[PDB]
Amino acid sequence: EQESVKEFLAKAKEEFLKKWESPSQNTAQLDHFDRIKTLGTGSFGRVMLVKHKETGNHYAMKILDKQKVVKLKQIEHTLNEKRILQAVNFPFLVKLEFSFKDNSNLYMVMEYVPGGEMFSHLRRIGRFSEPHARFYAAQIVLTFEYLHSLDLIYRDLKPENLLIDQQGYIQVTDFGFAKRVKGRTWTLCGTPEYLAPEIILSKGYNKAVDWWALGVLIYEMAAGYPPFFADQPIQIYEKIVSGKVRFPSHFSSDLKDLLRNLLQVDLTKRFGNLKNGVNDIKNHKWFATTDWIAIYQRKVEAPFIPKFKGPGDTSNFDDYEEEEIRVSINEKCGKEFTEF
Ligand SMILES: Clc1ccc(-c2c[nH]c([C@@H]3COCCN3)n2)s1
Ligand SMILES: Clc1ccc(-c2c[nH]c([C@@H]3COCCN3)n2)s1
């Protein structure tokens, strides 16, 4: 690669390691914020729009219930999420601004990205044109080049985890499955449609699973539906491990070629995992019109700017029942979360 790229990644790794070895902790508390709206909710956590009472700034606060994290066997994953988020820095990664814990919950206070999930915009428009898909895909390629160089595997690429910012660029959220891995790792995690075959087959797997998931994402952005779709996970998994993929006739020949190499069942033949690494992807004909430096510098005009009224607008997110943020008078699971 160009020495300028090698030196950039060397500095990125130095800066990551300094924060990784000495993580920040306990940098705000709950009563510094007003709660505004629930933006999403799941089996152990939720994300809420909040406003900082002294500065007036808006943030997305991810709240995890310690007891539910323990019950669902997510302790190590939640510790990974916060330790990685406080150590990374890249244009297309959502920034963690504060973190803290109390008797009941863990809190990660992130920048608020008001344009909403890519998923909403994709389903609204139906499918993205190839140039539009390629603009987003280029940002993911650069983000994975960065993360992988730090020995991080992301493991949760899907349209719901990619938010669109005020300039139309991506911000990757949700580091709940991200992990620092030199070599292989073994956990079954991720969403069914996006799982690589070696995850489904319970193998020791590596960063190649992120490049498989990029193939699924590009397919879904350009078609409007994912390549291995079926009604139940076991049926999805059978399709994935066969790897038989059908492409819409409107796909360009270059797009089909790139996707056959990303959706390669044999991980030892998959683009992103060969001797030339990410450069087999960046140099592929489907990306011939991409100016990688201009994307990194955010100098390319985006295909689409989300419609919103200001930094507190929640119109691009949906409506959930509003539940209390209860804090027990007694400390729960203190040992398990000591390092958070
Ligand atoms: Cl992943 C990435 C790999 C290499 C990257 C890179 C190389 N050079 C730059 C920028 C361009 O000008 C502003 C600062 N340096 N990024 S990103
Ligand atoms: Cl604005 C936002 C900033 C950060 C957000 C965030 C972090 N983690 C999640 C996930 C998405 O997938 C499943 C569970 N909650 N959103 S949204």
Q: Where are the domains of the chain?
A: 5-22+117-307, 23-116+308-338
Crossing angle for the helix pair 208-223 and 130-149, to the nearest 10 degrees: 170
Distance (Å) from CA 140 to ligand 2 centroid: 17
According to DSSP, the β-strands at 152-153 and 179-180 are antiparallel
Judge if the beta carbon of residue 162 lies within 6 A of ligand 2.
no
Query: What's the gap in Å between 311 CA and the centre of ligand 2?
Result: 17
Is 156 catalytic? The answer is yes
Q: How far is the CA of 259 from the centre of ligand 1 (A)?
A: 25
Between the two ends of the chain, the Cα-to-Cα distance in Å is: 37
The answer to whether domain 5-22+117-307 and domain 23-116+308-338 are alike in fold is no
3-state secondary structure the chain: CCHHHHHHHHHHHHHHHHHHHCCCCCCCCHHHEEEEEEEEECCCEEEEEEEECCCCCEEEEEEEEHHHHHHCCCHHHHHHHHHHHCCCCCCCECCEEEEEECCCEEEEEEECCCCCEHHHHHHHHCCCCHHHHHHHHHHHHHHHHHHHHCCEECCCCCHHHEEECCCCCEEECCCCCCEECCCCECCCCCCHHHCCHHHHCCCCECCHHHHHHHHHHHHHHHHCCCCCCCCCHHHHHHHHHHCCCCCCCCCCHHHHHHHHHHCCCCHHHCCCCCCCCCHHHHCCHHHCCCCHHHHHCCCCCCCCCCCCCCCCCCCCCCCCCCCCCCCCCCCCCCCCCCCC
Q: If you take atom 6 of ligand 1, which residue's CA is the nearest one?
A: 5
Out of 65, 156, 165, 210, pick the active-site residue. 156
CATH number belonging to the domain at 23-116+308-338, selected among 3.30.565.10, 3.30.70.330, 3.20.20.70, 3.30.200.20:
3.30.200.20
Q: What is the CATH architecture assignment of 5-22+117-307?
A: Orthogonal Bundle (1.10)
Q: Which residues line ligand 1 (CB under 6 A)?
A: 4-5, 8-9, 142, 145-146, 293, 296-297
Q: What is the resolution of this structure in A?
A: 1.4
Any atom of ligand 2 within 6 Å of the Cβ of 277: no
